Design a protein around this ligand. Structure first.
Ligand code: 3D1
Ligand code: MG
Ligand code: MN
Length: 510
């Protein structure tokens, strides 16, 4: 006899088969299609379970649409609810819209969300962290865990009553009890691997954000299935006898782990793989769902303004190695809103800049996170530390400036590179990290390392996101409670002539 476990992770509100780059876009992705793949495939097994492993409440323009309309997650919850999932876990982005929004979401879902390591006051935020069920005369035990690193990213007001414990420590403490109750153990961790599974070599700085390797290294023999996410990587292999899965993101793949009995009726791992999400001739989207997609596209097509010139980004890297009218524009909007000496923003992966006609679609693609902003008081020396962190983004390949391996592997982190406004500088990539920034000037004057300056950063950066630890606890001069997309919309609506001064002025070379 057998049992199959299907998992999607980091769906990120990509339900329809589109990434929204254009209205009629259609691509083999999204939860509708990924679920269709599960439904067809699962029928061959004696029984099966369906799991969402986090980062389901935020991510796509559909999520923006929901906040902007009823403020309710119900339309999204309805999709999950129809599909008859068995359980899920919490990802960090589940907190992006506040704790009440999350709590309301959990009570609207028709299956439990398991999180054993996030406490609210003196108990788990979620009703439970562990679930047990029978497979024949055996018992399966499931424990849900979430990356402890949330304080380094989220709005303080969204997590103020919460306590985040190490996933490794909570697992370590629960194992003994789980093994007393169950024969098969399944860990669903919304987090990834900090070391390469085969070599054990660190693949990122060991901050505790990701504890998957330490968990396997210490407890593999007692774990049958190790479900992971967060890093958006595609993994399906064995760690000793443990089946290890990471099913990417946006429903382009589905993780499937099959367990089957041997003589003695003992369940063992039969297979562990990623199933490709593909279109087929039986897949259909019902009328109501297509009506919702249309409303969504209609909203995305809403015209914000018409600019007198183009600010498109042809090649992302070009808009990172040197000033670009669009980065100049973003920084200028932040300087004008905040009145700080300096501002900064990352160029996000979907940021293609603006054409002359700007729609809601374009604004969201250029600022896809619900970040607010903060003006921080920092010494000129702390400012330099922040520019040196960004300068780590570059490396030299051949005799050309390129992107550092550190920011591409195991997966891309371009969003951790910032472009600054109000301060001019020179980055020398051939010099050691931490001493690459030269010629710093703020308004005709050299940056005095001992003087106090102000910088507008997003809330993610304010709590240290992307290893910008120098901003933590910097005095808050201004708390700007306007999210990025709206801040750009406001600026666009108030400055018709769009005469933008040059606030981004920097150079990158060896
Ligand atoms: N500016 C930002 N605002 C909100 N979230 C962001 C930002 N940049 C990265 N992320 C996401 C990506 C990962 O899920 C996680 C970092 O490991 O945070
Ligand atoms: Mg995540
Ligand atoms: Mn994610």
């Amino acid at each position: 006899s057998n049992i199959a476990f299907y998992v999607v992770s980091d769906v990120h509100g990509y339900i329809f088969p589109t990434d929204f780059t254009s209205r009629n876009q259609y691509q083999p992705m999204g939860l509708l299609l990924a679920n269709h793949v599960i439904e067809q495939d699962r029928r061959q097994y004696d029984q099966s379970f369906k799991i969402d492993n986090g980062d389901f409440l935020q991510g796509s323009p559909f999520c923006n649409y929901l906040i902007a309309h009823s403020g309710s997650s119900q339309p999204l919850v309805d999709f999950y609810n129809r599909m008859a999932f068995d359980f899920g876990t919490l990802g960090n982005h589940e907190f992006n819209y506040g704790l009440p929004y999350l709590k309301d979401t959990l009570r609207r879902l028709n299956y439990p969300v398991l999180c054993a390591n996030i406490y609210e006051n003196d108990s788990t935020l979620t009703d439970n962290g562990v679930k047990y069920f029978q497979v024949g005369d055996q018992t399966v035990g499931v424990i849900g865990l979430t990356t402890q690193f949330i304080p380094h990213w989220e709005q303080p007001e969204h997590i103020q009553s919460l306590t985040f414990h190490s996933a490794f420590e909570i697992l370590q403490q629960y194992l003994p009890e789980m093994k007393r109750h169950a024969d098969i153990i399944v860990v669903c961790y919304h987090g990834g691997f900090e070391k390469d599974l085969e070599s054990g070599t660190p693949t990122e700085v060991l901050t505790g954000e990701n504890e998957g390797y330490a968990m396997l290294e210490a407890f593999s023999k007692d774990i049958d299935i190790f479900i992971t996410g967060h890093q958006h990587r595609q993994i399906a292999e064995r760690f000793k006898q443990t089946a290890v899965i990471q099913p990417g993101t946006r429903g382009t793949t589905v993780g499937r782990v099959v367990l089957s009995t041997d003589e003695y009726e003992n369940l063992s791992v039969e297979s562990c793989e990623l199933l490709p999400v593909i279109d087929d001739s039986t897949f259909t989207i019902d009328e109501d769902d297509q009506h919702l997609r249309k409303q969504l596209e209609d909203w995305l097509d809403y015209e914000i303004t018409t600019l007198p010139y183009d600010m498109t980004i042809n090649h992302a890297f070009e808009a990172r190695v040197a000033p670009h009218p669009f980065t100049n524009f973003m920084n200028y909007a932040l300087l004008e809103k905040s009145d700080a000496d300096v501002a900064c923003t990352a160029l996000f992966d979907s940021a293609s800049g603006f054409k002359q006609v700007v729609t809601m679609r374009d604004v969201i693609n250029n600022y896809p996170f619900p970040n607010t902003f903060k003006v921080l008081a920092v010494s000129g020396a702390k400012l330099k530390e922040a520019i040196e962190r960004s300068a780590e983004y570059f490396d030299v390949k051949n005799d050309e400036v390129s992107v550092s391996a550190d920011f591409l592997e195991p997966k891309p982190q371009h969003f951790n590179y910032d472009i600054y406004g109000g301060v001019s500088y020179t980055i020398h990539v051939g010099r050691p990290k931490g001493q690459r920034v030269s010629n710093m000037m703020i308004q005709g004057h050299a940056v005095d390392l001992k003087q106090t300056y102000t910088i507008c950063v997003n809330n993610y950066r304010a709590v240290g996101g992307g290893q910008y630890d120098m901003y933590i606890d910097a005095p808050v001069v201004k708390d700007i409670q306007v999210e990025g997309a709206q801040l750009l919309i406001d600026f666009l609506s108030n400055n018709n002539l769009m005469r933008i001064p040059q606030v981004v002025d920097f150079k990158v070379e060896k």
